[PDB]
Design an enzyme around this catalytic site. Structure first.
Site, short mmCIF file in Angstrom:
data_model
loop_
_atom_site.label_atom_id
_atom_site.label_comp_id
_atom_site.label_asym_id
_atom_site.label_seq_id
_atom_site.Cartn_x
_atom_site.Cartn_y
_atom_site.Cartn_z
N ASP A 205 -27.80 56.34 42.14
CA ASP A 205 -26.70 55.46 41.74
C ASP A 205 -25.42 55.84 42.49
OD1 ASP A 205 -24.91 53.82 40.49
OD2 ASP A 205 -24.92 54.88 38.55
N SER B 66 -14.56 43.91 52.21
CA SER B 66 -15.26 42.94 53.02
C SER B 66 -14.27 41.95 53.61
CB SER B 66 -16.28 42.20 52.14
OG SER B 66 -16.89 41.12 52.81
#
Length: 330
Positions: free
Chosen positions: A35, A199
């Protein structure tokens, strides 16, 4: 040193991935959920409330000659999905894919919430975010990667998650045969303890690319792709009959649909998520309403590049003095 381990989807939807981990002496092998959105290595154990164990493999520290109680240490964690777990702490030897760390904090669960009990395939979590998020008190502990870093050939790990197929976590090296083209690296902020990056935009299907900054986290422990409501609405508007359902908890679409791809930007590069990766199947057994793999982050407080996005790429988690993220197509 290096390590290399295969990671395997837990079910036919790729809801999560499990990777075998050796703990203790002699080794006890547990299948953990790696994770990159958390920083605790915790396991089902001989200490876990018996009614909360249902098929998991447990770590028994009393059977490990290298286990030592970390005196006074406790831990307690709550995840973004509302699940939680807590317990006490041992140090022990932990190996992943041939890479060994001695003295790793292994957090033994005394209590786990229902969603962990109900998932017999996941024996615990191995956190790979920054150690500043580790919950052990009163002395915060280091992640497996943090402890191994100095010994690694290069201070990196990579995630190569499969679509409906096994993939690989590598530690300490970049497998140049595992991706196509070049790796594009992008800046990371560690201020929230996550692999947080920006992004450069998105496209829906064959549509034109929209240049827009989307701050979010690379999170192997989250199944879906959570993005701003504007972006998610633009995606689902291209699917006939798709709608946001408050009763189901997100966007659903007719199972008869063919989904468009979704592209996200990494600098000047582009990662394409095929439409099929966005299909999470019937909302309930036999339903013709299917659950979408792209959902709004509006209620979370952060955008999350979960498995839906990451499994379309070869992803480099670069833990150099100034960390960065790398993405390549594959």
């Amino acid at each position: 040193s290096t390590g290399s381990a295969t990671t395997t989807p837990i079910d036919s939807l790729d809801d999560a991935y499990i990777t075998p981990v050796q703990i203790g002496t002699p080794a006890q092998t547990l299948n953990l959920d790696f994770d990159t959105g958390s920083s605790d290595l915790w396991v089902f154990s001989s200490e876990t409330t018996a009614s909360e164990v249902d098929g998991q493999t447990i770590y028994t520290p009393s059977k490990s000659t290298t286990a030592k109680l970390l005196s006074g240490a406790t831990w307690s964690i709550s995840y973004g999905d509302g699940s939680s777990s807590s317990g006490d702490v041992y140090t022990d030897t932990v190996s992943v894919g041939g890479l060994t760390v001695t003295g790793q904090a292994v957090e033994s669960a005394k209590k786990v919430s229902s969603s962990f009990t109900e998932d017999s395939t996941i024996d615990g979590l191995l956190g790979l975010a920054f150690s500043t998020l580790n919950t052990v008190s009163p002395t915060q502990q280091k992640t497996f990667f943090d402890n191994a870093k100095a010994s690694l050939d290069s201070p990196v790990f990579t995630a190569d998650l499969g679509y409906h197929a096994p993939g690989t976590y590598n530690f300490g090296f970049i497998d140049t045969t595992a991706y196509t083209g070049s790796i594009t690296y992008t800046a990371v902020s560690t201020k929230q303890g996550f692999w947080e990056w920006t992004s450069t935009g998105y496209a829906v299907g064959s549509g034109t690319f929209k240049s827009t900054s989307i701050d979010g986290i690379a999170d192997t422990g989250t199944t879906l792709l959570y993005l701003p409501a504007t972006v998610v609405s633009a995606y689902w508007a291209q699917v006939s009959g798709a709608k946001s359902s408050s009763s189901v908890g997100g966007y659903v679409f007719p199972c008869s649909a063919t989904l468009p791809s979704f592209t996200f930007g990494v600098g000047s590069a582009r990662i394409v998520i095929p439409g099929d990766y966005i299909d999470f199947g019937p909302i309930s057994t036999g339903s013709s309403s299917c659950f979408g793999g792209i959902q709004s982050s509006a209620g979370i407080g952060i955008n999350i590049f979960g498995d839906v996005a990451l499994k379309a790429a070869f992803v480099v988690f670069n833990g150099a003095t100034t960390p960065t993220l790398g993405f390549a197509s594959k």
